[PDB]
Amino acid sequence: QHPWKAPGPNDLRSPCPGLNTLANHGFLPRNGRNITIPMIVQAGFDGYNVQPDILILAAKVGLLTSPEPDTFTLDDLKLHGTIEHDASLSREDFALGDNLHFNEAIFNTLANSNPGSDVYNITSAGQVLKDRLADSLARNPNVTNTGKEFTIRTLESAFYLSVMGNATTGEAPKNFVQIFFREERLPIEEGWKRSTTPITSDTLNPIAGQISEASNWKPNPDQCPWIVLSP
Amino acid sequence: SQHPWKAPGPNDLRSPCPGLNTLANHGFLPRNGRNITIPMIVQAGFDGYNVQPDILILAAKVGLLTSPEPDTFTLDDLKLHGTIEHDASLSREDFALGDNLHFNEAIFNTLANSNPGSDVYNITSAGQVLKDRLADSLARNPNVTNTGKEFTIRTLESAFYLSVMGNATTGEAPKNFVQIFFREERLPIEEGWKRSTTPITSDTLNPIAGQISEASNWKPNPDQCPWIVLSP
Ligand code: HEM
Ligand code: HEM
Ligand SMILES: *[C@@H]1O[C@H](CO)[C@@H](O[C@@H]2O[C@H](CO)[C@@H](O)[C@H](O)[C@H]2NC(C)=O)[C@H](O)[C@H]1NC(C)=O
Ligand SMILES: *[C@@H]1O[C@H](CO)[C@@H](O[C@@H]2O[C@H](CO)[C@@H](O)[C@H](O)[C@H]2NC(C)=O)[C@H](O)[C@H]1NC(C)=O
Ligand SMILES: *[C@@H]1O[C@H](CO)[C@@H](O)[C@H](O)[C@H]1NC(C)=O
Ligand SMILES: *[C@@H]1O[C@H](CO)[C@@H](O)[C@H](O)[C@H]1NC(C)=O
Ligand SMILES: *[C@@H]1O[C@H](CO)[C@@H](O)[C@H](O)[C@H]1NC(C)=O
Ligand SMILES: *[C@@H]1O[C@H](CO)[C@@H](O)[C@H](O)[C@H]1NC(C)=O
Ligand SMILES: [Cl-]
Ligand SMILES: [Cl-]
Ligand SMILES: [Cl-]
Ligand SMILES: [Cl-]
Ligand SMILES: [Cl-]
Ligand SMILES: [Cl-]
Ligand SMILES: [Cl-]
Ligand SMILES: [Cl-]
Ligand SMILES: [Cl-]
Ligand SMILES: [Cl-]
Ligand SMILES: [Cl-]
Ligand SMILES: [Mg+2]
Ligand SMILES: [Mg+2]
């Protein structure tokens, strides 16, 4: 019913492996266009068993990246400073290169994490957050690192652990996480199953909280958290 | 003819916005103030006032943050302090000091009495009102929030009352039209008000808000980061 197909050149994609994977399976429109908030809620439920609370807020902020009244394209979501942030797991900082497309060299840090284990977990996820921020601080003179970016980065790490793995423990098989990022594909052939446990603020926040404590974080002085309001 | 004024009944929801409240009171928006989508705001702003989508779409997307629903808000949701609703309102009390939702004559007194001895409000009077209303909040509200975000919104709101009740090009409005708009949330059609024949856009509003800004004698509160409260 929902086969994987690589996006063609008319097919718009985002910096989000979550939404890109849903589009690549037709849970969202395969062209990544004309997406409403209710379409996000239904796709997150259908693909991942993610519940509306977190999706509705993310989607309302996503709408700010679009000139349209009540839809965005996946490509709109690249707008730097709305949701898109520096120290991404698999994308370059906007200031240093391409903030939109999967990049293997950036992904290397997450790929190689939890060395010697068959899983990623909260400990490895925190170490990756720390290493990816340190890389941005070392190479990007324009890095934006406030409470807003940090909260989002901990919830994004909670999402990859939760959707590709176990939503209760935040432990995920490495091969599922690698396919999710590298191919934006549900690893069904490799044994991945949609969570039987609803994924909610109440499951994600405890995981994001533990990842937070394992990240050793401090905000940049002199930066006010902000949501860029227009493209 | 198709859009008569009716006072809201006791279960009709209203906002801190005379703009949206007036549209609801004429049925350009649902008279009950419920189930408002972004397209409904765009159509109502066009139909009532000849206001174009650019500014309405952004305001409505931020308004959605005040609602727990996927793609609608009520007019009453928009009272959420720190999303759009701000201190030093023209016609409402600060959230910290009282009622941030309902029209209040004692607050409105400053705008009512502005440009003394003239029959119009204009950019100069609008700036003096912004200065006096912020001075009042700084004096009486220990919790006043006064950043570039609240100031920009306050200048655009004053550009809106001048533009919709008056001349969208000059930002001059008849005092009578402005007083009816705030006090009754009614289009003063009986008293001679006509919908702009000139589209009201970011390009007409921003120059007026800019000149109101320069006439406001404004400075930000220094320790405060601009923020949009993301949930109720
Ligand atoms: C449905 C479940 C979701 C999952 C599992 C998910 C997962 C993720 C993950 C793991 C990242 C990190 C990518 C990286 O750092 O390289 C990410 C980033 C992002 N997501 Fe999502 N996401 C979801 C929903 C959403 C929604 C609803 C929106 C917006 C409407 C959104 C917008 C973004 C954006 C703009 C980024 C880029 C942040 C950055 O710069 O890395 N996501 N998402
Ligand atoms: C359509 C034309 C509009 C006009 C002419 C207009 C006009 C105004 C005016 C003059 C005020 C100031 C009230 C005061 O300070 O006492 C105001 C406040 C407000 N407006 Fe609007 N508005 C419009 C559209 C909107 C839209 C689309 C939204 C939200 C979706 C909105 C939300 C608000 C809010 C929340 C306030 C309260 C701010 C405060 O004083 O604390 N307005 N509006
Ligand atoms: C994440 O996985 C790693 C690797 O399995 C865990 O760290 C190891 O924990 C074992 C089991 O107690 C220790 O004996 C090893 O010495 C640890 N190795 C390293 C390099 O850390 C880690 O505990 C896991 N984290 C969570 C929250 O489950
Ligand atoms: C707004 O209206 C006021 C009052 O009419 C204007 O200020 C007056 O301007 C006249 C003629 O230019 C001066 O001679 C008066 O002394 C001013 N009166 C007061 C009360 O100050 C003001 O210029 C108008 N502003 C704009 C931008 O049109
Ligand atoms: C997820 O982890 C919990 C807690 O260890 C476990 O009981 C549950 O069976 C796991 N879920 C699946 C489907 O494996
Ligand atoms: C209007 O809004 C509420 C949510 O606040 C919804 O549950 C209700 O069904 C809607 N009613 C109509 C008539 O659309
Ligand atoms: C100011 O805000 C704080 C935090 O919300 C609140 O507890 C306090 O009562 C407020 N103080 C005044 C005088 O409004
Ligand atoms: C608005 O002001 C302009 C510039 O003075 C004027 O030419 C125009 O006619 C005014 N509009 C109306 C309907 O009076
Ligand atoms: Cl961008
Ligand atoms: Cl930048
Ligand atoms: Cl590691
Ligand atoms: Cl970190
Ligand atoms: Cl299969
Ligand atoms: Cl902005
Ligand atoms: Cl109605
Ligand atoms: Cl409130
Ligand atoms: Cl307050
Ligand atoms: Cl005055
Ligand atoms: Cl908030
Ligand atoms: Mg990024
Ligand atoms: Mg107010």
Author numbering:
A (entry chain B): 9 to 239
B (entry chain A): 8 to 239
Copied sentences from the primary study:
Unspecific peroxygenases (UPOs) are a class of heme‐thiolate oxygenases from fungi that have similar catalytic scope to P450s, but are dependent only upon hydrogen peroxide (H2O2) as the external oxidant. A recent survey by Faiza and co‐workers explored the diversity of UPOs within sequence databases and was able to identify two major groups of enzymes: ‘long’ UPOs (Group I), typified by AaeUPO, of approximately 45 kDa molecular weight, and ‘short’ UPOs (Group II), typified by the enzyme from Marasmius rotula (MroUPO), which are of approximately 29 kDa. In this study, we have cloned the gene encoding an ‘artificial’ short UPO (artUPO) close in sequence to MroUPO, and expressed it in both Pichia pastoris and E. coli.
We first crystallized artUPOyeast and determined the structure of the enzyme in two forms: the first in space group P212121, to a resolution of 2.01 Å and the second in C2221, to 1.21 Å, with two and one molecules in the asymmetric unit, respectively. Superimposition of the two, non‐equivalent, monomers in the P212121 structure give an rmsd of 0.21 Å over 231 C‐alpha atoms, suggesting that they are very similar. We cannot exclude the possibility of cooperativity in the mechanism of artUPO, although the kinetic plots presented are not suggestive of more than one phase in ligand binding. The side chain amine of K156 H‐bonds with the backbone carbonyl groups of G89 and T90 in artUPOyeast, and may also confer extra stability to the enzyme. The differences between the active site tunnels of artUPOyeast and AaeUPO‐PaDa‐I are also noteworthy. artUPOyeast is distinguished from AaeUPO by the replacement of characteristic phenylalanine residues in that enzyme with smaller or hydrophilic side chains including I91 for F121, L65 for F76 and K156 for F188, with G195 (common to AaeUPO and HspUPO) replaced by L163. Catalytic efficiency for the UPO substrate 5‐nitro‐1,3‐benzodioxole (NBD) was largely the same for both enzymes, and the structures also revealed few differences apart from the expected glycosylation of the yeast enzyme. However, the glycosylated enzyme displayed greater stability, as determined by nano differential scanning fluorimetry (nano‐DSF) measurements.
